[PDB]
């Protein structure tokens, strides 16, 4: 059981750039193999026996290494190369994998569009109340959301979900859901979600007030 460590865990590149990712091993390896996988598809073999290009794979891919240190290089990134890349070692059974390098497509900055929604009347009849905030079409991926209820920050009961990079414009989006009981929701008036991003000269604030209209 050799342990394989892949670096970086996540990285981004623009088409035309050189890309290099590494795979180091806890003990000496005999051969290293490299695989590429995109969401909803099976992995495909890229490199076998450390430095051999697999049949049908583009020649911009190459592999190298020896002993305990290996690498995979893309001489010039193409947009279609964005994927997760896994290394796998041969020494003796068991066969083990690294945990992957996720190669994202680098893209121009984009600010999020923020939208807040109150709980529906249908949900309230069930005894629950979910307040939803969409932060859509931003780049890069790191973003912070903060909830306030009648002006007081709320952290408990928030759940965030991120999309994968959009297949059309390469941005990210995120949903933030604040879940309350019906009774708790109806004991407060103002609900606010606030997005802070690298692009934001000021945090983007969206709110609604239950007793307004």
């Amino acid at each position: 059981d050799i342990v394989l460590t892949q670096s970086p865990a996540i990285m981004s590149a623009s088409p035309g750039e050189k890309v290099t990712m590494t795979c180091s091993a806890s003990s000496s390896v005999t051969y290293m193999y490299w695989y590429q996988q995109k969401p909803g598809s099976s992995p495909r073999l890229l490199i076998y026996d450390t430095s051999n290009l697999a049949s049908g794979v583009p020649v911009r891919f190459s592999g190298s290494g020896s002993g305990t240190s290996y690498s995979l290089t893309i001489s010039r990134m193409e947009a279609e190369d964005a994927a997760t890349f896994y290394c796998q070692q041969w020494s003796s059974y068991p066969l083990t994998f690294g945990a992957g390098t996720k190669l994202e497509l680098k893209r121009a900055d984009a600010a999020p569009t923020v939208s807040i929604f109150p709980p529906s009347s249908e949900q309230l009849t069930s005894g629950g109340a979910s307040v939803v905030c969409f932060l859509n079409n931003f780049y890069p991926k790191d973003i912070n959301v903060k909830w306030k209820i009648d002006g007081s920050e709320r952290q408990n009961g928030v759940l965030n979900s991120w999309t994968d990079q959009d297949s059309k414009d390469s941005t990210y989006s995120m949903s933030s859901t604040l879940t309350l009981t019906k009774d708790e929701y109806e004991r407060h008036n103002s609900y606010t979600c606030e997005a802070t991003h690298k692009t934001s000269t000021s945090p983007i604030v969206k709110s609604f007030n239950r007793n307004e209209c």
Partner: protein
Amino acid sequence: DVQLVESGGGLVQPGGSRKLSCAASGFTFSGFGMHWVRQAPEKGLEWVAYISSGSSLIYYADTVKGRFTISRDNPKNTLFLQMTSLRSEDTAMYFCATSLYYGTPWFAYWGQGTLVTVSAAKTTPPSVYPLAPGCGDTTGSSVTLGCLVKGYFPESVTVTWNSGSLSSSVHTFPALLQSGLYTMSSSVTVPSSTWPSQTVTCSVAHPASSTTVDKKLEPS
């Protein structure tokens, strides 16, 4: 061309068993060693088991040893994996794979995978809730709407939007698990000249319960 097709996946109770099959075509199956490899949801690859061309040599990952059995039927072009005493952490897409040569330890050809889900949760259809803006005036050339899809099991759900513009942008947010049940949401962004002036509905299909729900998005 070489082709590998897995079958047999599905929902399994904790502690239960399941037998997977892999059908081979386009090569002399009896001449090649074969592998199973699995991938838990949103995680990496993990090798599971190997069987040589004539079944003489078998290896297992330590984490499935004693529970899983790999076998093959060479005249009928089929690889098997019998699983027993299954646990939550065995939930994964299961792939069969083989190499270029007789018994080499790497994966040149892969099937499409069959999904095994280990859970005691009961199959439950979702509650579908519309996400419409609160009361108030709006500005800008576009408006965003959503649907909240709550408390379903198992995972498989598809949300499709009907709107009045081909330019409409849809985001599908990955489901999160709670108390054995899933919740997801979906947003749509449309030009503000098409809503509420034209109808917008989300259609939520949950095949495992053979249910489909349509929710019209109504203004405040």
